[PDB]
Amino acid sequence: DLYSRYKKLQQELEFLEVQEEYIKDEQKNLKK
Amino acid sequence: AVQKVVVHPLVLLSVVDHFNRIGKVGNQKRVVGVLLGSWQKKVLDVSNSFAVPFDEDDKDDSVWFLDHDYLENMYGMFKKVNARERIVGWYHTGPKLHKNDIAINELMKRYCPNSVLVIIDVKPKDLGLPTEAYISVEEVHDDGTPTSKTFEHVTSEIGAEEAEEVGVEHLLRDIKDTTVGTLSQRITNQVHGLKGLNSKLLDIRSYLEKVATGKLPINHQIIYQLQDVFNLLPDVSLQEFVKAFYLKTNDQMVVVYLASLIRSVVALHNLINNKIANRDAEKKEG
Amino acid sequence: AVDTAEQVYISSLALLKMLKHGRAGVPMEVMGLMLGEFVDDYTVRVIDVFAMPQSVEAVDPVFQAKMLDMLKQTGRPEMVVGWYHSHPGFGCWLSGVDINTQQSFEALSERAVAVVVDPIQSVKGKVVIDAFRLINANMMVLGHEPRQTTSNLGHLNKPSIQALIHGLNRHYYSITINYRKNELEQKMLLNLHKKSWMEGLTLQDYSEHCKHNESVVKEMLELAKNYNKAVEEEDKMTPEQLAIKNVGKQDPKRHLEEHVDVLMTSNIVQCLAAMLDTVVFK
Amino acid sequence: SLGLGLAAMGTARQDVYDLLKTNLYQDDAVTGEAAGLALGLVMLGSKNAQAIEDMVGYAQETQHEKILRGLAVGIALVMYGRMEEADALIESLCRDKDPILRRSGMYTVAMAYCGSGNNKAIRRLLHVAVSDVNDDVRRAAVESLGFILFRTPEQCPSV
Ligand SMILES: [Zn+2]
């Protein structure tokens, strides 16, 4: 688990960030 | 003088369709049709246009044909269907106008007081404003030209109308556009502007090196006129011009400063507004 | 022989020729011919549009044959596919005589298409375009379309009420329409609102510019005057009674952002262009 | 004709692909279903670059819609699970203005990234999900996620 903890948090980083950019996209499009 | 014209978006498409019509030849078939406009003012309005059969060989560009019969009948139909409309000039799809192009205007100056040409560009590689038009004059020169005759650049623009803006702009939904984009259209403006500057400079230097050496006419046409362009060239960094900037730039900086000042406080209101509602609804929720 | 999920291919000139004609003849039904090509049993394609004189009964077809002739010799020959007219401010529905020309036309060509247009209900964002297709009454019980695909059934829109009150399925069937765009017209249509470098390099003026800022700051002072009293005021009245007593003449917190935005966008570009004009020039 | 390639889908029958080509080059709508599907179906995983060039080279000049659709699926199926060379075609199809060929490329990135949990393609695929104008390539855009999420299937219902 502990090594898979450290891998799974990594996987929880970028897949979480793509949503961060994603809401930017959605908001800017919604303005239009 | 006419000094400018207002061309509607219908034309510039009613030409593209006809360039598409005889566009199967591919190699070269210059599209020529009739331009229709309004005797509006000194400024002139352009609304309608239509085509007419036209061909021309490769060598000795003096062999070209405009069906006067077709012109008479089809314009008779367009007058029967619209007396409000009327002939104003003509066009051709040439990317660069040809030496033959003066004989056409000189021919049909009998229909219009001056059948103004219209150059369109199906492939405006330049991202600037295409489809510019000229009107010929005589500029007999000290050289001894019996009739120094050449066209004249006249500024033009794109027409607009309530309905056509409706239908077109409903068609613009196929692509995204930021026309209300605050402080973005400006940045795009200076970008495309400087692009045009660089393009013009590269062109004029292409011509200038060619004429400078080897093979090009060295006429007194521009050679000193463009020198006078050098004549202006304001020497920006000098004594009092500094007082030109620092006595106003900080002025506008003051206004911007105040604007940021109130903007910060206005943004600060919502912090209290939502920090009240969050915890006050929480403590009452529990 | 059976219907399908048909598609109406258009020509970009066709739309403008529609709206300008109908708008010019706005107070009455304006009529015209729809000219195109029968691409297949499935879809249709219109490429050319033109109208005639009318004082709705069209006058002499001598205009017809000569028109199509001179359209053939210049450009090329084509095929008449349908027609159009206006329902100004109407329910864009085939009128009683409008259907009465339809047995006339479908008897001539099979896929004769009616085209309804209204330059009235069309806002600059979206146009109210329309077109229909007559259906027999002898097959009122028998099926008329095979419905071998969702596109013309559960994939398009929903019949409107003011035209469904006339046919909606009956005496005709609706049809889908799209827009085919040549890349040639597409590129130039992309760019028709830009200007030359002069516009992007203008410096408007600092006398009317500073005069303008001197203007907006003045009343903005008063907007702050009102804003002080309004914000501190706060009757404990619930967040919606404020929203019912604010209709009236109340407007703090709204103009305040506006004047700040405008004063920003002015001063910013006004400084920037002056910057570039000196960095770049000399 | 439509099931012809689905039957011979793993065998990669060049012989049936041959007559399927000339079936595809009839310039018609009735033969578009005849060749457009089985052509790539009998070349599933084949990566026949001449096949890609045939399909994309022919789906640029047509006039019908089925001849565009069968090619839209065949081009998306010709590349199978690469994730590393199909990128040029995914960009070539997504940058297009074709309301079907983008959606054709939108299906493509799904098959070139069969279940690919790569958070790279998720950026621009699920970005044209945002800025995309055509509803067709929009729905085809959002409908590539599960086709790219068997590595972590619990994430689809969160995005
Ligand atoms: Zn009617």
* B97 and B15, same domain (yes or no): yes
**Which residues of B14-172 form beta strands (DSSP E)?**
32-38, 44-51, 86-92, 133-134, 137-138, 149-150, 153-154, 156-158
Amino acid sitting at position C218:
K
Under 8 Å between Cβ of C35 and C18 = no
For residue B263, the tally of other CB atoms under 10 A from its CB is: 15
Please, which contacts does B183-186 make with residues 24 or more away whose CB atoms are closer than 8 Å?
B183/C264, B183/C265, B183/C268, B183/C269, B186/C200, B186/C265, B186/C269, B186/C272
* B158 and B31, same domain (yes or no): yes
* B32 and B162, same domain (yes or no): yes
CA C103 to centroid of chain Cα atoms: 30
Closest-CA distance, D133 to chain B, in angstroms, reads: 7
Tracing tokens 């948090």 back to the chain, one arrives at A9
D142 vs D130: CA distance, rounded Å: 9
Q: Decide if B201 is inside a domain.
A: no
Q: Decide if B53 is inside a domain.
A: yes
* B273 and B139, same domain (yes or no): no
Subunits close to C (at least 3 CB pairs below 8 A): B, D
What is the tally of structural domains in chain B? 2
- Count Cβ atoms within 10 A of the Cβ of residue C145 and give its class: 0-12 exposed, 13-18 middle, 19 or more buried: middle
Q: Decide if B210 is inside a domain.
A: no
Tracing tokens 């729905």 back to the chain, one arrives at D139
Closest CA to B106 of B131, B134, B79, B132: B134
- Count Cβ atoms within 10 A of the Cβ of residue C230 and give its class: 0-12 exposed, 13-18 middle, 19 or more buried: middle
Closest CA to B2 of B29, B35, B25: B35
Q: Decide if B194 is inside a domain.
A: no
B66 vs D96: CA distance, rounded Å: 40
D146 vs D143: CA distance, rounded Å: 7
* B173 and B273, same domain (yes or no): no
Closest CA to B129 of C102, D154, C197: C197
The nearest alpha carbon in chain C to B193 belongs to C197
CA angle D145, D150, D153 (to 5 degrees): 75
Closest-CA distance, D134 to chain B, in angstroms, reads: 8
Size of interface A-D (CB pairs under 8 A): 22
The nearest alpha carbon in chain B to C11 belongs to B17
Q: Decide if B191 is inside a domain.
A: no
* B255 and B171, same domain (yes or no): no
* B94 and B236, same domain (yes or no): no
CA angle B117, B118, B119 (to 5 degrees): 120
Domain boundary among B162, B182, B202: B182
Count of all residues that appear for chain D in the document: 159
DSSP string of chain D, one letter each residue: -HHHHHHTTTTT-HHHHHHHHHHHTT-SSTTHHHHHTHHHHTTTTT--HHHHHHHHHHTTS---SHHHHHHHHHHHHHS-S-SSSTHHHHHHHHSS--TTHHHHHHHHHHHHTTT---TTHHHHHHHHHHH---HHHHHHHHTTSGGG-SSSGGGGGG-
Count of all residues that appear for chain B in the document: 286
Amino acid sitting at position C145:
E
Domain boundary among B182, B201, B235: B182
Q: Which residues pair with B6 in a beta bridge?
A: B45, B157
Q: Decide if B21 is inside a domain.
A: yes
Under 8 Å between Cβ of D71 and D25 = no
Subunits close to B (at least 3 CB pairs below 8 A): C, D
A11, A18, A25: residue with CB nearest D131: A25
* B83 and B155, same domain (yes or no): yes
B32 vs B28: CA distance, rounded Å: 12
CA D29 to centroid of chain Cα atoms: 19
Under 8 Å between Cβ of B152 and B190 = no
C63 vs A30: CA distance, rounded Å: 51
Best residue of B189, B199, B257, B273 to probe chain C, by most C CBs closer than 10 Å: B189
Q: Which residues contact B63 (CB under 8 A, 6 or more apart)?
A: B56, B57
Closest CA to B37 of B84, B88, B76: B88
Domain span holding position B244: 223-282
B256 vs B262: CA distance, rounded Å: 10
Q: Which residues in C lie closer than 8 A to residue B189 (C-beta atoms)?
A: 195, 199-200
The answer to whether the annotation marks C235 as part of a ligand binding site is: no
D111 vs D76: CA distance, rounded Å: 7
DSSP string of A1-32, one letter each residue: -HHHHHHHHHHHHHHHHHHHHHHHHHHHHHH-
Q: Which residues contact B254 (CB under 8 A, 6 or more apart)?
A: none
Q: Between β-strands B133-134 and B153-154, what pairing exists: parallel, antiparallel or unpaired?
A: antiparallel
Chains D and C touch (3+ CB pairs under 8 A): yes
The nearest alpha carbon in chain A to D118 belongs to A15
Q: Annotate C91-123 with b (16+ C-beta within 10 A) or e (fewer).
A: bbbbbeebbebbeebbeeeeebbbbbbbbbbbe
Please, which contacts does B176-182 make with residues 24 or more away whose CB atoms are closer than 8 Å?
B176/A32, B176/D131, B176/D133, B178/A32, B179/C193, B182/C261, B182/C265
Under 8 Å between Cβ of B54 and B32 = yes
For chain B, the distance separating the N- and C-terminal CA atoms, rounded to the nearest angstrom, is 82
- Taking each helix axis as running N to C, give the angle between helix D14-24 and helix D49-58, from 0 to 180 degrees, rounded to the nearest 10: 10
Q: How far is the CA of C86 from the centre of ligand 1 (A)?
A: 6
Q: Between β-strands B133-134 and B137-138, what pairing exists: parallel, antiparallel or unpaired?
A: unpaired
Tracing tokens 């607009």 back to the chain, one arrives at B160
Chains A and C touch (3+ CB pairs under 8 A): no
D139 vs C36: CA distance, rounded Å: 32
B228 vs B173: CA distance, rounded Å: 47
* B173 and B249, same domain (yes or no): no
- Count Cβ atoms within 10 A of the Cβ of residue B149 and give its class: 0-12 exposed, 13-18 middle, 19 or more buried: middle
Q: How far is the CA of C54 from the centre of ligand 1 (A)?
A: 14
Rounded-to-10 torsion of CA B107, B110, B113, B118? -30
Looking at chain D, the residues that come just before a C–N gap of over 2.5 A are none
Say whether C20 and B161 touch across the interface (CB within 8 A).
Answer: yes
Q: Decide if B76 is inside a domain.
A: yes
Method: cryo-EM
D129 vs D139: CA distance, rounded Å: 8
* B51 and B150, same domain (yes or no): yes
Which alpha helices (H) appear in chain B, and where do they start and end?
16-21, 68-80, 101-107, 162-171, 185-212, 225-232, 241-246, 249-285
Closest CA to C129 of C243, C22, C270, C237: C22
Q: Decide if B97 is inside a domain.
A: yes
A32 vs A25: CA distance, rounded Å: 11
C240 vs C229: CA distance, rounded Å: 19
Say whether D63 and C42 touch across the interface (CB within 8 A).
Answer: no
User: Does any CB of chain C come closer than 8 Å to the CB of residue D123?
Assistant: no
Count of all residues that appear for chain A in the document: 32
* B22 and B157, same domain (yes or no): yes
Q: Annotate B199-219 with b (16+ C-beta within 10 A) or e (fewer).
A: eeeeeeeeeeeeeeeeeeeee
CA angle B164, B165, B167 (to 5 degrees): 65
Say whether C43 and D97 touch across the interface (CB within 8 A).
Answer: no
Q: What is the resolution of this structure in A?
A: 4.1
Query: Residue B41 carries which DSSP code?
Result: S
CA C119 to centroid of chain Cα atoms: 9
B65 vs B103: CA distance, rounded Å: 11
CA distances from C109 to B29, C143, C277, D138 (A): 35, 22, 65, 38
Residue C178's φ and ψ, nearest 5 degrees, are: -130, -170
* B170 and B29, same domain (yes or no): yes
Domain boundary among B129, B158, B182: B182
